[PDB]
């Protein structure tokens, strides 16, 4: 069924699945040991796969997700695709393992005493985190690809605290159109979506910048949930009216203005990822 890809294929006999790292309504990620996955050392990794009762579309979706990763290329701030098992057996997408989990949980677990999300990140750490992710997106955008699902839950943290952009499930190649237009309705990450994406079904690098602004908000609120007490239909209304989230507590006006710039009503007026990287670099340098 699935067209083999020798250069990326990896022997199942050299892979030992382990404990689950994350589960979803359309997937499953587990830890594993890959023998010789390193071309220079014939290795703890993560393996993404389908649920036991997945459909044809769930398969096509994961395959498309893998393909996007193959095309994007390597970058320090993008989770590394190591290989895949696509022949005679379930589809396994092997990716670099991030020992500190996703950004959301990473931050929430590192909030100050008494600020627990339920029953420590310095200011500079927050800027650095943001800067690393901006670099990752600048790279992705330069490949003329859009992520479409930027959010703290989709950022992984390695043992060395390196930020890695992940989950390319909604990622699209816009090299030929410079803008992806979703022709139909579907379940999308609405609270991280730009107005033109939500209402016009138009996605661009600038709609990714809007999402980056929301991600920035999540970072500075240490894992806060976008639009506090605002339900589904309630959010759609507010955005139409011009609503924008308030400034996080531990945030300078400069960084908040950067967030607000990412949420400019006019897509072309939002900063480019290159501009964000330059400005963030400047802020870090002065903070250092």
């Amino acid at each position: 069924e699935l067209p083999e890809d020798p250069k990326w294929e990896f022997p199942r006999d050299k892979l030992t699945l382990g404990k689950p790292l994350g589960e979803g309504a359309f997937g499953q990620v587990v830890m594993a040991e890959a023998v010789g996955i390193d071309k220079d050392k014939p290795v703890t990794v993560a393996v993404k796969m389908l649920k036991d009762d997945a459909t044809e579309k769930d398969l096509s979706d994961l395959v498309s997700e893998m393909e996007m990763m193959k095309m994007i290329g390597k970058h320090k701030n993008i989770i590394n695709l190591l290989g895949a098992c696509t022949q005679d057996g379930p589809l396994y997408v092997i990716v670099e393992y991030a020992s500190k989990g996703n950004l959301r949980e990473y931050l929430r677990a590192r909030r100050p005493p008494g600020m627990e999300y339920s029953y420590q990140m310095t200011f500079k750490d927050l800027v650095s985190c943001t800067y690393q992710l901006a670099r990752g997106m600048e790279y992705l955008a330069s490949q003329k690809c859009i992520h479409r699902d930027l959010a703290a839950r989709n950022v992984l943290v390695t043992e060395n605290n390196v930020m890695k952009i992940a989950d390319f499930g909604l990622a699209r190649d816009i090299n030929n159109i410079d803008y992806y237009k979703k022709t139909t309705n579907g379940r999308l990450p609405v609270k991280w979506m730009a107005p033109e994406a939500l209402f016009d079904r138009v996605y661009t690098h600038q709609s990714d910048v809007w999402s980056f602004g929301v991600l920035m908000w999540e970072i500075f609120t240490l894992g806060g949930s976008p639009y506090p007490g605002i339900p589904v239909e309630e959010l759609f209304k507010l955005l139409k009216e011009g609503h924008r989230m308030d400034k996080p507590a531990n945030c300078t006006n400069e960084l908040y203005m950067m967030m607000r710039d990412c949420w400019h009503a006019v897509p072309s007026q939002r900063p480019t990822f290159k501009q964000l990287v330059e400005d963030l670099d400047r802020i870090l340098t002065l903070t250092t």
Binding site: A151, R153, R187, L188, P189, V190, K191, V232
Partner: peptide, 4 residues
């Protein structure tokens, strides 16, 4: 809840 994140995807609607």
């Amino acid at each position: 809840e994140e995807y609607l």
